[PDB]
Amino acid sequence: TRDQNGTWEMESNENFEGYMKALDIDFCTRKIAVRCTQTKVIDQDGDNFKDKTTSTFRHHHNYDVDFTVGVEFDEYTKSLDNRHVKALVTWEGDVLVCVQKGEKENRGWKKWIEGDKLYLELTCGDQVCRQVFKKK
Amino acid sequence: TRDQNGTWEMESNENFEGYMKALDIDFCTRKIAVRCTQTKVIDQDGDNFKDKTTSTFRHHHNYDVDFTVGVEFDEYTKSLDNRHVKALVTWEGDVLVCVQKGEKENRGWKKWIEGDKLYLELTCGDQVCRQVFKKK
């Protein structure tokens, strides 16, 4: 049949990456594109076609870590760089301090409550990242 | 206080990029990561901690094409390789065939209905991508 009308959702995709490589599309764009869902809405009247394609990309991470203050533990940083570190969490006053011994120097974090907000500082090398959290 | 229990929503995030760079996380991953919402659930029993961090990002784009079988039209392949092609669609039996005339050789696609599924094969050079769609 020549009637292609419908709302069409992709259920299988094969060699999308090879096709995109042949288009000289960069590795980054290919990595995102291949993870997209696709919906095609085809509105066809005879030989007249209106094709509306929607591409969706979703990213979702859960990262669970359990530890006891003062007991060195093994950490696998799966929601970041996916490296093995040996982490030691201690208290310095009211600040929770973690050193992550491993490949990177100066790697760790500090976490404390101030003014009913949670403060986190992550360090790696000469880089410090500062994050602030609100109670939901 | 040393009580860090709570469901915490991130409201400020500064020098995340420099930190991820120091961890050798690539630009492709960083552009996704800086746009994720972050929720940290801290369940703390004395010096025993369970930290659950959730991070989520959603994005979509659209790609619309209108054409008539047998009428050549200009197509700009936005969200693919961003080139101008001269597209000519014809029927070969019940198979809809497009040639995208332009810089890439052997560039085109074929689209047909079989059973109740839509089949698409996109070609560029010697690379063929095959996609299958079900009616939703």
Give the CATH number, domain containing residue A35: 2.40.128.20
Long-range contact list for B80-86, CB < 8 A, 24+ apart? B80/A20, B80/A23, B80/A25, B81/A20, B81/A23, B81/A24, B81/A25
Cα–Cα distance for residue pair A119/B44, rounded to 1 Å: 16
Resolution of the entry in angstroms:
2.2
- Strands, E assignment, chain B: 6-14, 37-45, 48-68, 73-76, 84-92, 95-101, 108-114, 117-124, 127-135
Residues in B touching A67 (Cβ below 8 Å): 49, 51
Q: Do residue B49 and residue B78 come from a single domain? A: no
Q: Do residue B78 and residue B25 come from a single domain? A: no
Inter-chain CB proximity A6 and B81 less than 8 Å: no
> Does residue A50 lie in a domain region?
yes
Q: Do residue B77 and residue B52 come from a single domain? A: no
Cβ–Cβ under 8 Å, residues A45 and B69: no
Q: Which alpha helices (H) appear in B41-133, and where do they start and end?
A: none
> Does residue B82 lie in a domain region?
yes
Experimental approach was: X-ray
Q: Do residue A52 and residue A78 come from a single domain? A: no
Q: Do residue B12 and residue B47 come from a single domain? A: yes
> Does residue B101 lie in a domain region?
yes
Cα–Cα distance for residue pair B10/A133, rounded to 1 Å: 4
Residue B40, token pair as written in the block? 């940290």
Q: Do residue A79 and residue A39 come from a single domain? A: no
> Does residue B65 lie in a domain region?
no
Q: Do residue B81 and residue B121 come from a single domain? A: yes
Cβ–Cβ under 8 Å, residues A42 and A5: yes
> Does residue B68 lie in a domain region?
no
Inter-chain CB proximity B55 and A70 less than 8 Å: no
Q: Do residue B130 and residue B95 come from a single domain? A: yes
CA A53 to chain centre: 25
Q: What total of structural domains would you count in chain A? A: 2
> Does residue B1 lie in a domain region?
no
Residues in A touching B132 (Cβ below 8 Å): 10-12
Q: Do residue A129 and residue A84 come from a single domain? A: yes
Closest CB to A23 among B47, B59, B104 = B104
Residue B68, token pair as written in the block? 């008539």
> Does residue A1 lie in a domain region?
no
Inter-chain CB proximity A15 and B128 less than 8 Å: yes
Closest CB to A131 among B1, B3, B10 = B10
User: Counting Cβ atoms within 10 Å, is residue B115 exposed (0-12), middle (13-18) or buried (19+)?
Assistant: exposed
Q: Does B82 touch chain A (CB under 8 A)?
A: no
Q: Do residue A46 and residue A86 come from a single domain? A: no
To the nearest whole Å, the CA of A36 is away from the closest chain B CA by 9
User: Residues 10-49, chain A: which have Cβ within 8 Å of B?
Assistant: 10-16, 18-25, 27-28, 31-33, 38-40, 42, 47-49
Domain containing B82 equals 73-134
> Does residue B96 lie in a domain region?
yes
Inter-chain CB proximity B19 and A64 less than 8 Å: no
